């Protein structure tokens, strides 16, 4: 008999003041939270953010909504959420978020006989995640999502994860083109602003960028060109045209491939690691050309000294390049 | 009791005229303001703007909302704000502003027994900042946010910073990859339009641009290519093809340099510092090539004069380039 249920619902909402939290003037109301992650679409290095779609569900007991005589869960139309008190939960590190509204607003209100209220939403958010790209592309990131009450302090509302470490689900099925999720963590704490102490929940993922075709295509050409630039020392004074052609080719080819590589790197204006590596390779080819120039100049007056300098370079250049590669590997790998 | 508080609030809102400001027809209402800066998402030179997320808090007194019998501060629901008088504060230099609305409108209303209203909003605004790129990338940018009352003149409303120089916090939370904040300032004044005089508050920031990326990517390659261009002065006339190849290589590489961040700048009519440096380097390389052409043309009939020209150039060019660098870095820095 839907008439009896309608009478019960109208009686519950009669004299219901939405401007007062449950147990107003008394103990704080405990709100439990569950998150079901659906996808993580884009983790933008340029914009320093990531997109996240979730089913966000909250639970709280309200004594004003306790009904008797109906032994069933009452799943009400989502518009009833406009007549009930709901927590003012918000995210602190989001830049633009929306609740889906097709075909209707994705919102769920479920009342239980003991006054328990379950309030569910489907939310797509763009959360800010600062990144330390100084180790690009061998970088690791820690992206967090923060949850807090906007108006009620810990004297009025308390947050907690409903289910301990098994509250947030679906992270394992999340797949990304670049990164791979290694760990996720849940934290509950209190944050003290100048207005008071508010509850805080934090869901933090750790991402590790993959390694593949791009790692080879950004180092191997440059190191191969730098290695090939050392054949200049083993060429005698005869066939010096080959030496000049080799030096010019190394310079031109390295510059061309460096530009065609930087055309694909993320457009952020600060010093990464690959940029320093490419600068080091360019400095090496420049030094090789300068050494060739000096040897050629002093060749006529002191041929023995020029030959000795070439012999010295034969050992010096690979050793210094290996030493610099070792330093780079220690500092940035 | 909840019913008693509900009755008190209903009595407060009963017979309340939202259309009339507090003390209508009498003294102006004093509004204090606080800003807590969450972050600055981006600072764009193409569109000449910057994105700013903040908590904006306003403080005023409305004697019509004064209540007695409750020794508590009523932190009410956000929707209650729709039934009160709030100032018409707006930002004169904003282009797209919105209040975050997930999971609810990030709005806070707090009433006090003295009839004192505190009203908090979480606002993301894209403010318009006009930039002088004459010294790019060695420039400082002063970006302001203007806060003004739209409909109420100085006879109706007054603005001030609540707390003084400490009214704006969260300045240290701002992290920009290509900028570093130097200083922030608070200004209070009056602005006169054809419709009357209005109060005005101003929050100013002075950002400084990071130079490390530009030194790594622009200045060092150009200096290295300019140095490489001088190699031809130490080459004998018998190796004329080497000199031609060296000059052509230097010119081509100088043209190739600095194609990394073309799209992230507007179409300004003037000339920037980086453009000046690139033009100077290109002029030096072109002059070296022209000197080679002149020497090769004249060396057949006047070998001694060509030798003198080469021996003078190999000293003049490095000195001239050093003087040019001295003038550049003494003027712009």
């Amino acid at each position, epitope marked *: 008999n839907m008439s009896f249920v309608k009478e019960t619902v109208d009686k519950l909402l009669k004299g219901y003041d939405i401007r007062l939290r449950p147990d107003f003037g008394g103990p704080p109301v405990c709100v439990g939270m569950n998150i079901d992650i659906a996808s993580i679409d884009m983790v933008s290095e340029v914009n320093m953010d990531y997109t996240l779609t979730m089913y966000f569900q909250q639970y709280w007991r309200d004594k004003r909504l306790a009904y008797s005589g109906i032994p069933l869960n009452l799943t009400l139309d989502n518009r009833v959420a406009d007549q009930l008190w709901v927590p003012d939960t918000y995210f*602190l590190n989001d830049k633009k978020s929306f609740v889906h509204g097709v075909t209707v607003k994705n919102r769920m209100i479920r009342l239980h006989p003991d006054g328990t209220v379950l309030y569910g939403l489907r939310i797509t958010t763009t959360a800010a995640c600062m990144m330390d790209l100084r180790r690009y592309p061998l970088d690791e990131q820690n992206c*967090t999502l923060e949850i807090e009450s906007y108006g009620y302090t810990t004297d009025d509302i308390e947050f907690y994860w409903r289910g301990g470490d098994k509250a947030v689900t679906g992270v394992e099925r999340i797949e990304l083109p670049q990164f791979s999720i290694v760990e996720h963590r849940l934290v509950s704490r209190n*944050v003290v*602003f*100048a207005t008071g102490a508010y509850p805080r929940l934090s869901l933090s993922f750790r991402l590790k960028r993959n390694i593949g075709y791009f790692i080879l295509q950004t180092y191997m050409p440059s190191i191969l060109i730098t290695i090939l630039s050392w054949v200049s020392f083993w060429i005698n004074y005869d066939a010096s045209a080959a030496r000049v052609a080799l030096g010019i080719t190394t310079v031109l080819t390295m510059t061309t491939i460096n530009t065609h590589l930087r055309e694909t790197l993320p457009k952020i204006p600060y010093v990464k690691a690959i940029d320093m590596y490419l600068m080091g390779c360019f400095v090496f080819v420049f030094l090789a050309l300068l050494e060739y120039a000096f040897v050629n100049y002093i060749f006529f007056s002191q041929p023995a000294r020029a030959a000795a300098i070439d012999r010295w370079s034969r050992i010096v250049f690979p050793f210094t390049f290996s030493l610099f590669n070792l330093v780079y590997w220690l500092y940035y790998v | 009791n909840m019913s008693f508080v509900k009755e008190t609030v209903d009595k407060l809102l009963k017979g309340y005229d939202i259309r009339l400001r507090p003390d209508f027809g009498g003294p102006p209402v004093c509004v204090g303001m606080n800003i807590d800066i969450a972050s600055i998402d981006m600072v764009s030179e193409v569109n000449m703007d910057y994105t700013l997320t903040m908590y904006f808090q306003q403080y005023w007194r409305d004697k019509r909302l004064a209540y007695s019998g409750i020794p508590l501060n009523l932190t009410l629901d956000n929707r209650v704000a729709d039934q009160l008088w709030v100032p018409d504060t707006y930002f004169l230099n904003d282009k797209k502003s919105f209040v975050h609305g997930v999971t609810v409108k990030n709005r806070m209303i707090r009433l006090h027994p003295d009839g004192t209203v505190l009203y908090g909003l979480r606002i993301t605004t894209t403010a318009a900042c006009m930039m002088d790129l004459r010294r790019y990338p060695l420039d400082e940018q002063n970006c302001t946010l203007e806060i003004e009352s739209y409909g109420y003149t100085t006879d109706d409303i007054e603005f001030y910073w609540r707390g003084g120089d400490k009214a704006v916090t969260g300045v240290e939370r*701002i992290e920009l990859p290509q900028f*570093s*904040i130097v200083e*922030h300032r608070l200004v209070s004044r009056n602005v006169v339009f054809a419709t009357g005089a209005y109060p005005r508050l101003s929050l100013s920031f002075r950002l400084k641009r990071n130079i490390g990326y530009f030194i790594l990517q622009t200045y060092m390659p150009s200096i290295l290519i300019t140095i490489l261009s001088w190699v031809s002065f130490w080459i004998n006339y018998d190796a004329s093809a080497a000199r031609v190849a060296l000059g052509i290589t230097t010119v081509l590489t100088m043209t190739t340099i600095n194609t990394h961040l073309r799209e992230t700048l507007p179409k300004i009519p003037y000339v920037k510092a980086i453009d000046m440096y690139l033009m100077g380097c290109f002029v030096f390389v072109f002059l070296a090539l022209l000197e080679y052409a002149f020497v090769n043309y004249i060396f057949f009939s006047q070998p001694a004069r060509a030798a003198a020209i080469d021996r003078w150039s190999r000293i003049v060019f490095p000195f001239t380039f050093s003087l040019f660098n001295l003038v550049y870095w003494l003027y712009y820095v």
Partner: nanobody
Amino acid sequence: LRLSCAASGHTFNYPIMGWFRQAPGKEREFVGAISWSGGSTSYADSVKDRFTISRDNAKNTVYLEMNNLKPEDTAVYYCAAKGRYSGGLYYPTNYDYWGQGTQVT
């Protein structure tokens, strides 16, 4: 004098360093705070124009220079790290990791 706070580990997740002083009869109180890229050296009112805080990421150190010492300056000093979204700056509860105490006469 000149105190130095040096951080080791995941320093990027805690980009704000703060100084606190504790008296024998009073709880720890905020003195200064520095952001690596925020450029806003925040100071307490009692230590304005007398203490200075500088930063350097070359070895990830924060320098606290003290000038015009007073008898009330005798307190044990601590250095603490604060998260990116940890809230207020003047409140010791928001800081996760703390440094060993140091005495100044």
